[PDB]
Design a protein around this ligand. Structure first.
Ligand code: L98
Ligand code: ZN
Length: 305
């Protein structure tokens, strides 16, 4: 163990922190398991906010992809910032009073442990595939959004394997189940990744645009403007297919298709110099600037209820 917000923490440490951060803030945090990974790890979810009746929520997950360590770190950073500024910073104070932040620290816990124990560049889950020795399904290719129709491979040996079927992975099915069971309160979906420095919105499984395309563009545009204030970090934004690439089975598209109108995929630092191996020395600056974008989007969603 040995948790730090300016260092990448292994799963043993992250799970301990989830337990500790909750015990330390009973007034603002409630911890919950929403399923288990292929290998027996508990998929924790933290409900951040001042408890109240029938509050709306914003759902944020991190750790979809094992090697994207900066995203895991961001979920942790966010949790601390939320509790230390509550009551001192008016926006965060109003956010926690009005809505609940569902923060899922790590979805792909199994693959995360693998980047720590054997392969730093692992991406997919660690599940078994019939008829092959090849391990893993790409979790952001396993959702029911034009599933496996483009930008996904049907071969288990490929890094973008779409799974045997949609929600084949316990992790994705568990995330999907949760979102389906709380659809009523969940107003926005935020999924944290790296790298590329981008804010994306639906659709990636198709070149069609969402109904609120222009609204999402204005918002993604405003958010990137916020993030840039701190250290001049430049992000690009736009619909997935044209901004990054057509890829089916993404959770952002899926959530949008559930009715969640504000759905964004965040690609954090770098642009490629360090890529997935972003120095721990950049954790704070990265998390700081990203906080401004997330809070910007939260304030918009909130003031649009
Ligand atoms: N539906 C999508 N494919 N969305 C999507 C948008 C931006 C980045 C990605 C990456 C994140 S590593 C990825 O999952 O490969 C996916
Ligand atoms: Zn990713």
């Amino acid at each position: 163990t040995g948790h730090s917000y300016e260092k990448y923490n292994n799963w043993e440490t992250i799970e301990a922190w989830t337990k500790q951060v909750t015990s330390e803030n009973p007034d603002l945090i409630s911890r919950t398991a929403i399923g288990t990974t292929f290998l027996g790890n508990n998929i924790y979810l933290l409900k951040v906010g001042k408890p109240g009746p029938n509050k709306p929520a914003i759902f944020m997950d991190c750790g979809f992809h094992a090697r994207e360590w900066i995203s895991h770190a961001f979920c942790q950073w966010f949790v601390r910032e939320a509790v230390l500024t509550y009551g001192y910073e008016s926006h965060m104070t109003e956010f926690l009073n009005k809505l609940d932040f569902y923060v899922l620290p790590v979805l792909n816990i199994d693959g995360y442990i693998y980047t720590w124990t054997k392969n730093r560049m692992w991406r997919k889950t660690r599940s078994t595939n019939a008829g092959t020795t090849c391990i893993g399904t790409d979790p952001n290719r396993n959702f029911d959004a034009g599933w496996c129709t483009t930008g996904a491979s049907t071969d288990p040996c490929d890094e973008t394997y779409c799974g045997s079927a949609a929600e084949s992975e316990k992790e994705t099915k568990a995330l999907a189940d949760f979102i389906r069971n709380n659809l009523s309160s969940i107003k926005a979906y935020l999924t944290i990744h790296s790298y590329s420095q981008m804010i994306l919105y639906p659709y990636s499984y198709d070149y069609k645009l969402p109904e609120n395309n222009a609204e999402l563009n204005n918002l993604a545009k405003a958010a990137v403007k916020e993030l840039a204030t701190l250290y001049g970090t430049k992000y690009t934004y736009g619909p997935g297919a044209t901004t990054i690439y057509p890829a089916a089975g993404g959770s952002d598209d899926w959530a949008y298709d559930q009715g969640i109108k504000y759905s964004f995929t965040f690609e954090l630092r770098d642009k490629g110099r360090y890529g997935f191996i972003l120095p721990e020395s950049q954790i704070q600056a990265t998390c700081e600037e990203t906080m401004l974008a997330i809070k910007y989007v939260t304030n918009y969603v909130l003031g649009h209820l």
